[PDB]
Amino acid sequence: RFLKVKNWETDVVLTDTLHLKSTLETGCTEHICMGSIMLPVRTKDQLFPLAKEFLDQYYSSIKRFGSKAHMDRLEEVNKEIESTSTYQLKDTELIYGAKHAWRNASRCVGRIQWSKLQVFDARDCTTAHGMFNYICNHVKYATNKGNLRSAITIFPQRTDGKHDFRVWNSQLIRYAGYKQPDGSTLGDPANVQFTEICIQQGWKAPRGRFDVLPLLLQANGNDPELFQIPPELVLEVPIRHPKFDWFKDLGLKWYGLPAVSNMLLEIGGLEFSACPFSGWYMGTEIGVRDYCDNSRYNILEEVAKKMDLDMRKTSSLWKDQALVEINIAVLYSFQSDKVTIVDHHSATESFIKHMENEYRCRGGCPADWVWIVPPMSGSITPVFHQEMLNYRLTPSFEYQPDPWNTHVWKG
Amino acid sequence: RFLKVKNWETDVVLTDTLHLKSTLETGCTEHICMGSIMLPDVRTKDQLFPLAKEFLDQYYSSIKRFGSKAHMDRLEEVNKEIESTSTYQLKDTELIYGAKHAWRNASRCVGRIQWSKLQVFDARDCTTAHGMFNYICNHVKYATNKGNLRSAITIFPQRTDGKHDFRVWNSQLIRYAGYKQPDGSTLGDPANVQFTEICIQQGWKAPRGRFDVLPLLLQANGNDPELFQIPPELVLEVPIRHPKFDWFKDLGLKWYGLPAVSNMLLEIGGLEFSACPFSGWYMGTEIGVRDYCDNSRYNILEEVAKKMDLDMRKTSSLWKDQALVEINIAVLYSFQSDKVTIVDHHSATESFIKHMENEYRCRGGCPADWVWIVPPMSGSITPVFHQEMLNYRLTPSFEYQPDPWNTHVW
Ligand code: HEM
Ligand code: HEM
Ligand SMILES: N#Cc1ccc(CCNCc2ccc3ccc(N)nc3c2)cc1Cl
Ligand SMILES: N#Cc1ccc(CCNCc2ccc3ccc(N)nc3c2)cc1Cl
Ligand SMILES: C[C@H](O)[C@H](O)[C@H]1CNc2nc(N)[nH]c(=O)c2N1
Ligand SMILES: C[C@H](O)[C@H](O)[C@H]1CNc2nc(N)[nH]c(=O)c2N1
Numbered sequence: 062r063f064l065k066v067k068n069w070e071t072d073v074v075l076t077d078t079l080h081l082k083s084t085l086e087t088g089c090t091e092h093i094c095m096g097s098i099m100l101p102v103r104t105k106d107q108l109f110p111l112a113k114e115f116l117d118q119y120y121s122s123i124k125r126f127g128s129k130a131h132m133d134r135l136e137e138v139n140k141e142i143e144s145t146s147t148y149q150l151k152d153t154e155l156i157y158g159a160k161h162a163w164r165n166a167s168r169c170v171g172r173i174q175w176s177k178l179q180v181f182d183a184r185d186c187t188t189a190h191g192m193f194n195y196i197c198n199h200v201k202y203a204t205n206k207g208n209l210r211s212a213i214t215i216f217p218q219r220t221d222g223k224h225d226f227r228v229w230n231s232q233l234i235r236y237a238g239y240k241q242p243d244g245s246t247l248g249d250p251a252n253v254q255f256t257e258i259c260i261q262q263g264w265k266a267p268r269g270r271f272d273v274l275p276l277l278l279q280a281n282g283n284d285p286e287l288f289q290i291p292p293e294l295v296l297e298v299p300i301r302h303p304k305f306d307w308f309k310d311l312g313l314k315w316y317g318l319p320a321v322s323n324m325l326l327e328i329g330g331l332e333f334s335a336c337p338f339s340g341w342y343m344g345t346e347i348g349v350r351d352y353c354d355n356s357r358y359n360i361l362e363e364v365a366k367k368m369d370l371d372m373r374k375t376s377s378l379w380k381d382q383a384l385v386e387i388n389i390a391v392l393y394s395f396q397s398d399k400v401t402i403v404d405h406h407s408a409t410e411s412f413i414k415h416m417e418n419e420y421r422c423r424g425g426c427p428a429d430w431v432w433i434v435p436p437m438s439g440s441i442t443p444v445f446h447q448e449m450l451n452y453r454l455t456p457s458f459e460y461q462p463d464p465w466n467t468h469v470w471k472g
Numbered sequence: 473r474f475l476k477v478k479n480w481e482t483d484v485v486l487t488d489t490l491h492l493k494s495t496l497e498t499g500c501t502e503h504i505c506m507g508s509i510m511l512p513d514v515r516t517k518d519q520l521f522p523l524a525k526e527f528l529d530q531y532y533s534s535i536k537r538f539g540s541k542a543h544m545d546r547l548e549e550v551n552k553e554i555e556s557t558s559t560y561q562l563k564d565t566e567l568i569y570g571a572k573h574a575w576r577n578a579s580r581c582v583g584r585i586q587w588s589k590l591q592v593f594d595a596r597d598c599t600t601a602h603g604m605f606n607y608i609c610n611h612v613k614y615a616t617n618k619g620n621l622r623s624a625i626t627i628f629p630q631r632t633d634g635k636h637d638f639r640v641w642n643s644q645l646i647r648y649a650g651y652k653q654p655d656g657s658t659l660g661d662p663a664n665v666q667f668t669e670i671c672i673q674q675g676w677k678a679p680r681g682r683f684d685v686l687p688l689l690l691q692a693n694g695n696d697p698e699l700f701q702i703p704p705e706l707v708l709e710v711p712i713r714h715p716k717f718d719w720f721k722d723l724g725l726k727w728y729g730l731p732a733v734s735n736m737l738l739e740i741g742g743l744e745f746s747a748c749p750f751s752g753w754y755m756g757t758e759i760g761v762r763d764y765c766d767n768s769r770y771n772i773l774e775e776v777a778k779k780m781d782l783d784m785r786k787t788s789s790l791w792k793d794q795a796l797v798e799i800n801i802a803v804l805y806s807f808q809s810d811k812v813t814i815v816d817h818h819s820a821t822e823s824f825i826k827h828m829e830n831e832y833r834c835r836g837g838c839p840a841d842w843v844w845i846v847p848p849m850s851g852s853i854t855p856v857f858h859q860e861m862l863n864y865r866l867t868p869s870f871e872y873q874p875d876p877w878n879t880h881v882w
């Protein structure tokens with residue numbers, strides 16, 4: 062079965078045959094589209110087909126499909142499965158898997174870079190302290206004094222689901238959030254709950270507007286532990302505006318390294334519940350969402366106030382005007398400090414080229430339009446006008462529940 | 473099977489039961505979501521009666537008369553008419569219910585909070601293109617209302633056997649002409665280029681400017697379509713000025729007041745109305761963002777940027793974005809200053825969230841296409857961006873249909 066997608070600004074048509082290799086489910090049916098819904102142990106019965114599928118894909122890529130080396134590997138794996146009810150990935154396989162999970166991530170506009178990923182094997186790690194050390198090295202490596210490098214650190218896979226490795230932080234670096242007695246929030250409202258956990262776990266909170274949270278790390282299913290990331294490792298950028306001198310006096314800054322740590326990496330049926338990964342920012346993540354979401358730092362009013370905009374009638378588009386200035390400032394700041402960042406015009410543009418390339422050499426590129434189109438200036442980016450097919454491939458990054466909701470506490 | 477949608481900016485959760493009564497497909501499956509796809513002959517008589525019955529059942533339910541013998545009476549009456557004439561005719565009341573509910577069910581429409589206040593013009597007695605022109609002039613005049621716009625729809629005779637099709641060949645009653653001129657550049661609207669010269673190809677004489685209102689091309693009873701010019705005094709246009717920059721007038725931009733879509737097909741109880749132009753009023757971004765700034769359209773960003781003397785170095789200065797905002801500020805300013813109806817995208821999305829809360833509470837749900845409801849600029853600072861929505865097809869409905877010229881037997 063063939064499937065065609067059209068770009069309505071260019072009239073470019075592509076043909077998708079990759080969706081035919083789609084395993085997982087979308088959530089959609091013939092009678093309902095769930096395209097804007099935010100959210101989508103294991104036995105031997107189901108494990109070896111998943112393993113075989115992965116190994117078929119792997120040996121295809123390395124042009125050795127049907128080789129003796131391919132057959133032995135399959136033989137090696139199901140025997141290890143029958144014997145031990147799981148199996149171990151070779152280094153080359155783990156690297157292939159991590160890269161393709163990224164490549165398969167339909168919601169990620171940054172996928173043009175998927176082949177260049179630094180994979181850190183942390184499967185030999187046994188304690189929270191060992192986790193902290195690995196994560197420190199990830200951060201230093203990825204940050205690279207502002208010249209950011211994509212990386213992922215992979216901790217041991219789930220076994221019986223009772224000994225999971227987890228990073229309890231949603232991101233390796235993120236600011237604390239403190240609900241005040243009067244209802245107001247100091248810092249990042251997105252992190253109020255997690256902040257409170259840290260505090261209960263023993264974290265002495267500085268209680269400022271931009272406090273970098275401590276790492277909260279769980280190894281082998283034990284209770285998690287607190288660690289402060291060495292400050293000399295946390296790169297930050299003070300936010301200024303190229304023309305607006307008062308903007309610096311807003312007291313804003315952000316950290317340079319986006320490093321997502323709460324997702325689950327699935328490769329050939331194995332589940333890696335701790336797999337922090339990092340790239341670099343698209344400007345709008347900070348300038349639009351982190352700074353201007355009502356449920357976040359929410360600075361539109363204050364910024365628009367000091368711009369002296371007509372703020373009483375929303376038809377003045379004072380919100381829209383302030384939003385552009387803030388995103389200009391975020392970009393200006395990262396560039397002036399020689400910290401890697403990409404504007405949403407450049408990013409969406411490169412993604413169109415990537416997606417085109419992927420249809421040609423791979424037969425498709427799964428893509429979630431709802432997530433790929435930038436949160437401002439949508440129709441003046443080329444992805445807005447691009448039809449996309451959304452489907453799920455493995456290897457993949459999955460969501461998982463928050464560890465505090467599922468953890469059995471030891472004491 | 474009893475689904476929940478969450479607003480992530482407010483934590484409000486609505487439970488959807490209405491989706492259960494959906495019948496038509498989405499294009500999606502368990503394996504593939506086609507949510508971002510733009511576009512995913514007459515019916516037999518045993519195809520038609522279940523369609524009739526479903527419609528009649530909900531009509532009589534709506535008027536608190538479900539299971540009444542008056543309900544039963546109408547059912548048998550229609551069944552006999554179908555059995556006999558292989559079709560049937562809508563009562564005036566049913567026709568009005570059908571139209572309002574086709575709008576209520578348009579999951580891509582952000583302005584649906586107004587769905588019940590729709591003026592329905594029954595044009596089912598029309599027999600000629602000249603008659604169509606007349607009905608359409610009255611529609612336009614009524615809808616425009618000297619700037620104080622009023623929602624309206626005009627319904628021409630239903631399809632019969634596909635030979636008697638009434639169609640309006642225009643996509644909107646009012647649109648600007650577009651010509652391919654010698655430089656290889658485009659004067660006027662590039663989106664209408666093909667239509668703009670099917671017009672002269674049948675007799676039009678173009679004033680070859682950049683904002684020439686197109687002639688109506690009307691097709692009655694399957695006959696060859698005919699050209700009629702809308703009386704200029706019926707076409708309300710707004711000169712585009714900016715409230716702070718007054719080099720802006722020199723751009724010489726204008727647009728029309730009345731968005732009136734004329735190429736869709738209205739389905740009611742199995743019956744197909746192939747000519748059913750309807751109109752409401754503009755959301756600001758349709759003009760400022762799409763009509764003016766699309767690369768496939770008037771594409772005026774660079775020009776505007778230049779006059780703002782912005783850093784057009786590379787993309788990172790966000791000059792496109794800065795200009796986009798000013799352009800949309802001017803559209804809203806112009807329309808408002810002429811007291812011509814227009815809604816900004818903040819106001820209209822907030823209206824729609826409230827409409828959702830009304831529809832979930834009184835109807836059990838509200839079908840909604842997130843990809844279309846989110847405005848084409850400033851997406852995440854509108855409430856709808858953070859609103860989960862379920863998309864499904866309810867009938868009565870507005871559907872798409874082939875462009876007439878690709879079908880019409882000459
Ligand atoms: C290198 C530069 C990169 C850029 C500019 C980029 C850009 C983005 C953006 C803007 C999002 C949407 C996030 C949001 O709105 O919250 C996203 C999502 C995502 N990205 Fe990338 N990304 C990059 C690298 C990576 C890497 C290295 C990985 C994994 C190894 C990755 C995997 C993902 C995944 C799995 C999502 C889905 C997020 C979710 O579902 O919550 N990306 N990306
Ligand atoms: C009165 C104020 C109204 C507003 C502010 C409004 C707003 C909108 C907007 C912004 C769109 C997106 C279309 C696009 O971007 O091309 C849309 C689509 C649509 N509207 Fe509404 N509308 C209004 C009235 C109406 C009326 C009166 C009807 C029918 C009687 C209607 C039926 C539809 C339908 C069927 C679509 C889908 C368009 C398509 O599928 O191509 N609207 N509306
Ligand atoms: N509430 C909430 C909530 C908030 C956000 C999300 C998705 C967040 N995705 C963040 C993300 C993931 C990967 C990235 C990769 C690179 C990059 N620059 N940013 C990313 C950002 C999901 C939920 Cl349920
Ligand atoms: N090509 C193409 C193409 C381009 C645009 C569209 C959408 C056209 N419908 C626009 C529309 C429909 C109804 C409206 C009602 C009110 C309003 N203010 N705007 C509308 C705008 C559809 C297609 Cl197939
Ligand atoms: C309800 C809706 O799915 C949700 O708000 C989505 C919309 N699209 C998004 N797109 C990106 N990149 N990031 C997001 O958090 C969201 N949020
Ligand atoms: C391919 C994609 O579906 C296309 O660009 C859509 C996106 N969303 C839209 N939303 C609205 N309101 N109007 C449109 O024309 C479109 N076009």
Ligand SMILES: [Zn+2]
Nearest residue numbers: 089094500505
């Ligand atoms: Zn879908």
